[PDB]
């Protein structure tokens, strides 16, 4: 399962 940091990184990469 992806880490929360990975989720946050993806958010900021695309916003």
């Amino acid at each position, epitope marked *: 399962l992806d*880490s*929360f*940091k990975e*989720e*946050l990184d993806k*958010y*900021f990469k695309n*916003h």
Partner: antibody, heavy 113, light 111 residues
């Protein structure tokens, strides 16, 4: 990682306050959380490991700014202060799992006439 | 946004007894997005556990938890004096980034 914040502040309504958070000595997502005397915890927002972007809690959007160069302390500035902003302000490091694993010692900000 | 409601407001138990602390989310969540904290007077909170009972380094075995959907529990099985404190749950989301906290449960010594 140990987090050391700046000292307590006293402010009049309408002023602003700027608190610093320094890693004593990898960069990490840094968050700010405040706690009014005798009350619970309230998240304010976060800043990315590089400092290139932020995201704030809805209640503070338009009033708060979080800044970091790269290896400079990180700051939280809160404007248009009222007595409701009296609280201890904490900075915190996020772990990869999303919880706050290291906390600063807190900075008391008192807002009063 | 997710809203967290903790119960009870105050829990009064004796050393050696088992404490059950509840956190209810306003919508169904995966417990990976819930964390528990301990806070004592004069101190910053301390991270304990995620919603799925996964403890962080240095947290004793007597701390456990469980849940799925809207209801989550932190269980402290054989209370020690150092366990009496205020406990908060926390939920986090990444899109858009949003954290929230429950209002806290005070775990106090019954004598």
């Amino acid at each position: 990682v140990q987090l050391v914040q700046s000292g307590a502040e006293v402010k009049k309504p309408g002023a602003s306050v700027k608190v610093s958070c320094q890693t004593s000595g990898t960069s990490y997502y840094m968050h700010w959380v405040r706690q009014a005397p005798g009350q619970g915890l309230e998240w304010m927002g976060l800043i990315t490991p590089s400092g290139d972007d932020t995201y704030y809690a809805q209640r503070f959007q338009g009033r708060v700014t979080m800044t970091r160069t790269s290896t400079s302390p990180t700051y939280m500035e809160l404007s248009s202060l009222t007595s409701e902003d009296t609280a201890v302000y904490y900075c915190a490091k996020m772990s990869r799992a999303g919880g706050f694993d290291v906390w600063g010692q807190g900075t008391l900000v008192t807002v009063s006439s | 946004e997710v809203v967290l409601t903790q119960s009870p407001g105050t829990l009064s138990l004796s050393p050696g007894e088992r404490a059950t602390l509840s956190c209810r989310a306003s919508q169904s969540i995966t417990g990976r997005y819930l964390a528990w904290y301990q806070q004592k007077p004069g101190q910053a909170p301390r991270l304990l556990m995620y919603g799925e009972s996964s403890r962080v380094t240095g947290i004793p075995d007597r701390f456990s938890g469980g849940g799925s959907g809207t209801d989550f529990t932190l269980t402290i099985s054989r209370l020690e004096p150092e366990d009496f404190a205020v406990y908060y749950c926390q939920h986090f989301a990444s899109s858009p980034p949003t954290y929230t906290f429950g209002q806290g449960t005070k775990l106090e010594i019954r004598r």
